[PDB]
Amino acid sequence: WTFGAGAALQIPFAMQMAYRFNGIGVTQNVLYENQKQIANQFNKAISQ
Amino acid sequence: CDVVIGIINNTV
Numbered sequence: 001w002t003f004g005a006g007a008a009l010q011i012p013f014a015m016q017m018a019y020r021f022n023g024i025g026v027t028q029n030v031l032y033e034n035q036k037q038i039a040n041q042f043n044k045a046i047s048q
Numbered sequence: 049c050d051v052v053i054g055i056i057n058n059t060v
Binding site: 035 | 051
């Protein structure tokens with residue numbers, strides 16, 4: 001998230017979107033327990 | 049403990 005103001009942090013982006021779950025204000029529980037779920041939901045969004 | 053990579057035991 002240090003990007004823009006900053007150079008970089010090299011984060012593998014499930015972690016980044018975990019912190020994106022929290023500035024949208026939801027849990028982390030959905031994430032890994034919906035690993036492929038959310039991933040391929042997004043992938044269907046990609047094809048859409 | 050389902051989609052766990054976290055190794056951490058000994059937890060307090």
